[PDB]
Scaffold this active site. Structure first.
Site, PDB file in Angstrom:
ATOM      1  N   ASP A 114       0.840  -1.202   0.000  1.00  0.00           N
ATOM      2  CA  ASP A 114       0.000   0.000   0.000  1.00  0.00           C
ATOM      3  C   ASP A 114       0.875   1.252   0.000  1.00  0.00           C
ATOM      4  O   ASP A 114       2.080   1.139   0.212  1.00  0.00           O
ATOM      5  CB  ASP A 114      -1.070  -0.020   1.125  1.00  0.00           C
ATOM      6  CG  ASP A 114      -0.511   0.141   2.532  1.00  0.00           C
ATOM      7  OD1 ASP A 114       0.628  -0.261   2.827  1.00  0.00           O
ATOM      8  OD2 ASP A 114      -1.248   0.671   3.369  1.00  0.00           O
ATOM      9  N   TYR A 118       2.704   4.953   0.930  1.00  0.00           N
ATOM     10  CA  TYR A 118       3.332   5.555   2.101  1.00  0.00           C
ATOM     11  C   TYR A 118       2.187   6.324   2.734  1.00  0.00           C
ATOM     12  O   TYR A 118       1.356   6.906   2.011  1.00  0.00           O
ATOM     13  CB  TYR A 118       4.472   6.504   1.697  1.00  0.00           C
ATOM     14  CG  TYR A 118       5.713   5.794   1.180  1.00  0.00           C
ATOM     15  CD1 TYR A 118       6.441   4.900   2.002  1.00  0.00           C
ATOM     16  CD2 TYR A 118       6.135   5.954  -0.144  1.00  0.00           C
ATOM     17  CE1 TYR A 118       7.542   4.183   1.511  1.00  0.00           C
ATOM     18  CE2 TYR A 118       7.241   5.234  -0.631  1.00  0.00           C
ATOM     19  CZ  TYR A 118       7.924   4.359   0.204  1.00  0.00           C
ATOM     20  OH  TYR A 118       8.958   3.643  -0.297  1.00  0.00           O
ATOM     21  N   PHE A 143       6.848   1.883  -3.989  1.00  0.00           N
ATOM     22  CA  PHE A 143       8.209   2.228  -3.507  1.00  0.00           C
ATOM     23  C   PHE A 143       8.744   3.640  -3.731  1.00  0.00           C
ATOM     24  O   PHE A 143       9.490   4.149  -2.928  1.00  0.00           O
ATOM     25  CB  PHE A 143       9.277   1.223  -4.024  1.00  0.00           C
ATOM     26  CG  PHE A 143       9.010  -0.217  -3.650  1.00  0.00           C
ATOM     27  CD1 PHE A 143       9.261  -0.676  -2.374  1.00  0.00           C
ATOM     28  CD2 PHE A 143       8.497  -1.106  -4.586  1.00  0.00           C
ATOM     29  CE1 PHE A 143       9.001  -1.998  -2.025  1.00  0.00           C
ATOM     30  CE2 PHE A 143       8.237  -2.421  -4.242  1.00  0.00           C
ATOM     31  CZ  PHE A 143       8.489  -2.872  -2.961  1.00  0.00           C
ATOM     32  N   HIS A 198      11.197  -9.737   1.337  1.00  0.00           N
ATOM     33  CA  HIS A 198      10.833  -8.312   1.402  1.00  0.00           C
ATOM     34  C   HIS A 198      12.079  -7.391   1.513  1.00  0.00           C
ATOM     35  O   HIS A 198      13.030  -7.724   2.244  1.00  0.00           O
ATOM     36  CB  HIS A 198       9.901  -8.092   2.606  1.00  0.00           C
ATOM     37  CG  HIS A 198       9.135  -6.821   2.524  1.00  0.00           C
ATOM     38  ND1 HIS A 198       9.587  -5.645   3.080  1.00  0.00           N
ATOM     39  CD2 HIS A 198       8.022  -6.503   1.825  1.00  0.00           C
ATOM     40  CE1 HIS A 198       8.804  -4.655   2.706  1.00  0.00           C
ATOM     41  NE2 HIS A 198       7.846  -5.152   1.945  1.00  0.00           N
TER      42      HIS A 198
END
Length: 228
Positions: A72, A74, A85, A194
């Protein structure tokens, strides 16, 4: 004016019409849309509305070479702008993104890293940076995760992948890997842990950027300049 109206509200580039229009029609989509609009009535929603679909504007479906999946946006004002990102240019790269940029540099030391975290250059180069959840309530991580974005996004990715075999998928972490499962015989599927520094394996060791370019080349597709 279903598509005409939808496209006007979010300022979507028309090249994506074939991929997105079929979705508009799904009744599940109307619930998603009304819910997003109800949230906007009652909280600070990020990113801003005209940024939600920025990814449709950087390149067309036929220009897409790599797909990187995120979770999702920021949740602090000023960071997110519609891409997974990536942060706006004068925003210091948060932890996970630093690790991504660290990995690129290890993979391609002749890389011209600007030190910035804005991935618009990549987006224009056909690297589709797509979050499964497209909005978040300010300050609350994962707060919009059950409203329906993933069904809609997954629908668009399924139609993109069918339209063009030989895509490279970069699935980082458990969530990305459980959300999108492309045919590994038809596309290049790259899995890794991750990018956050909290992962057991340090992301800077990831060599997906190298392997991706090796796959593209064997398909007579030009390789990506991961400099940014």
């Amino acid at each position: 004016l279903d598509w005409t109206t939808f496209r006007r509200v979010f300022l979507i580039d028309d090249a994506w019409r074939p991929l997105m229009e079929p979705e508009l029609a799904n009744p599940l989509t109307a619930h998603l849309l009304a819910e997003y609009n109800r949230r906007c009535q009652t909280e600070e929603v990020l990113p801003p509305r005209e940024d939600v679909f920025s990814w449709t504007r950087y390149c067309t479906p036929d220009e897409v070479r790599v797909v990187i999946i995120g979770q999702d946006p920021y949740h602090h004002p000023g960071q997110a702008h519609g891409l997974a990102f990536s942060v706006r240019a004068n925003v210091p790269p948060p932890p996970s993104l630093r690790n991504v940029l660290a990995a690129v540099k290890n993979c391609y030391p002749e890389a011209r890293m600007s030190g910035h975290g804005c991935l618009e250059k990549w987006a224009r180069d056909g690297v589709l940076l797509l979050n499964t959840t497209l909005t978040v309530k300010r300050g609350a991580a994962a707060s919009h995760s059950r409203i329906g974005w993933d069904r809609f996004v997954g629908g668009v990715i399924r139609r993109l992948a069918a339209r063009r075999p030989g895509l490279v998928f970069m699935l980082w972490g458990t969530h990305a890997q459980n959300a999108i499962r492309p045919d590994p015989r038809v596309h290049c599927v790259l899995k890794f842990s991750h990018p956050s520094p909290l992962s057991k394996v340090p992301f800077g060791t990831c060599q997906h950027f190298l392997v991706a370019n090796r796959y593209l080349e064997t398909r007579s597709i030009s390789p990506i300049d991961w400099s940014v």
